[PDB]
Amino acid sequence: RGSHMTPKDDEFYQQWQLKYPKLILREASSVSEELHKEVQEAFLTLHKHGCLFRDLVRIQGKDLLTPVSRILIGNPGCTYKYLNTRLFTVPWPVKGSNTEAEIAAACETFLKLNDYLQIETIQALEELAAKEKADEVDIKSRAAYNVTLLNFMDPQKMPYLKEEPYFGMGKMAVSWHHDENLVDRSAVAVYSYSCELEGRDPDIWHVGFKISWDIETPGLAIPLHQGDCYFMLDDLNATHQHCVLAGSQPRFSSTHRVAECSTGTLDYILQRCQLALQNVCDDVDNDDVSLKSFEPAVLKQGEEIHNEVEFEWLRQFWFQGNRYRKCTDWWCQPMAQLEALWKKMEGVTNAVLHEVKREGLPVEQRNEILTAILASLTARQNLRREWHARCQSRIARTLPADQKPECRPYWEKDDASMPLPFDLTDIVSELRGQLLEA
Ligand SMILES: O=C(O)c1ccc(O)c2ncccc12
Ligand SMILES: [Zn+2]
């Protein structure tokens, strides 16, 4: 049958070397007591301050609340997306940077831990190549952790856990998965903080590993003790799945990643909004939006940017109910700015819609405009329905008022502030009809 192996098994170590040599372990002994102290207290610090939330995530069409409580720390303006949920960094003091005293201290600590792990990770990948010898830049970028996802779980207060289905590894805190949204072949480092027979010891936390598509090959269950670190190197996260097996005591972790944020940063999205608004006459800011060109390429692109800021930025931010306010104000002004920018894009879709009706506009070029924008607008209407439904589902309403989702922006048709209804069913339908006239 399907079994697993631990340090109890004679085969365990050779199985490790032979089948998971890109998984590395650096025991609590390899880390200074000083760093242990600052890191452990920092975790406890963010706990006390209530900085950690279970995410309302999406899996195969279903709203699910992660058993695990989490928080994202890392470079300002940066984001990490998983299970359709874009987490926004609580900022850590990278250079040239400039929210509450203790919380701030905790972030700085996890940055320090970030520095050191980076150093360890580079050292291991160098060792790794010298083994495979029998570029420096690739090594550097693959260890350039711009984030850490902190996790917490107290099995005693969150005992609603699923049994491990293939190897008998027992209760799972995190189910078999690949880590999403990472740079290619980028390492991941994990600092592990536990608070105090046949098979794995159920009282103690483990990380589980299995080869993709493979349940005939015995999985590895590595025991995680207080302050132990381990590293997933090179293509290990692509070639294998991993899980977290729950012990009996609470445990925190810091899981540093190289987030693939090419479309995932404040800077990037602000720049995109700027590009869209290049098609707008910008002398003054008022609700009479006039556009420079109605050339299809440009309008399509403007409507796509409209969508990208609405759903991937605004709705994602407010669906979490602005939990981050508790930790920082960093994103408050940028999200007012992103909404202001988006609101202006609502005037653009609308001037496009005005133009399409305009009396003396040849049907050939009209049809051009429609063909350019149709996909965008129908994607906007489908994504609005979805996010509204994601905001109102039963599991959401059970969240405390400080995490209650916020469907935003959202306006009622009895609102003269917005030039277009929030519901586009009508408009889209008319556009489809026009595009099929004779
Ligand atoms: O160690 C953890 O607590 C952890 C939690 C959730 C994850 O997705 C992980 N992914 C890779 C390595 C560790 C983890
Ligand atoms: Zn993972």
Swiss-Prot record:
Impact when changing E180P: Abolishes enzyme activity. Abolishes ability to demethylate N(6)-methyladenosine RNAs (m6A) RNAs
Known outcome of mutating F88D: Perturbs interaction between N-terminal and C-terminal domains and strongly reduces enzyme activity
Keyword Repeat: no
Presence of the UniProt keyword Nucleus in the record: yes
Gene3D superfamilies: Alpha-ketoglutarate-dependent dioxygenase AlkB-like, FTO C-terminal domain
Notes on how activity is controlled: Activated by ascorbate. Inhibited by N-oxalylglycine, fumarate and succinate. RNA N(6)-methyladenosine demethylase activity is inhibited by fluorescein derivatives. RNA N(6)-methyladenosine demethylase activity is selectively inhibited by meclofenamic acid; inhibition is specific to FTO and meclofenamic acid does not inhibit ALKBH5. Specifically inhibited by R-2-hydroxyglutarate (R-2HG), an oncometabolite that also exerts a broad antileukemic activity.
Modified residues (N6-acetyllysine): K162
Entries under Pfam families matching the protein: FTO_CTD, FTO_NTD
GO molecular function terms noted in the UniProt entry: broad specificity oxidative DNA demethylase activity; ferrous iron binding; mRNA N6-methyladenosine dioxygenase activity; oxidative RNA demethylase activity; transferase activity; tRNA demethylase activity
Protein name: Alpha-ketoglutarate-dependent dioxygenase FTO
Location of the protein in the cell: Nucleus; Nucleus speckle; Cytoplasm
Region spans: Loop L1: 159-170
Annotated segments matching region Fe2OG dioxygenase domain: 6-262
Keywords (A to Z) from UniProt: Acetylation, Cytoplasm, Dioxygenase, Disease variant, Iron, Metal-binding, Nucleus, Obesity, Oxidoreductase, Phosphoprotein, Transferase
Quaternary assembly: Monomer. May also exist as homodimer.
Catalytic activity: a 5'-end (N(7)-methyl 5'-triphosphoguanosine)-(N(6),2'-O-dimethyladenosine) in mRNA + 2-oxoglutarate + O2 = a 5'-end (N(7)-methyl 5'-triphosphoguanosine)-(2'-O-methyladenosine) in mRNA + formaldehyde + succinate + CO2; an N(6)-methyladenosine in mRNA + 2-oxoglutarate + O2 = an adenosine in mRNA + formaldehyde + succinate + CO2; N(6)-methyladenosine in U6 snRNA + 2-oxoglutarate + O2 = adenosine in U6 snRNA + formaldehyde + succinate + CO2; a 5'-end (N(7)-methyl 5'-triphosphoguanosine)-(N(6),2'-O-dimethyladenosine) in U6 snRNA + 2-oxoglutarate + O2 = a 5'-end (N(7)-methyl 5'-triphosphoguanosine)-(2'-O-methyladenosine) in U6 snRNA + formaldehyde + succinate + CO2
Cofactor note as given: Binds 1 Fe(2+) ion per subunit.
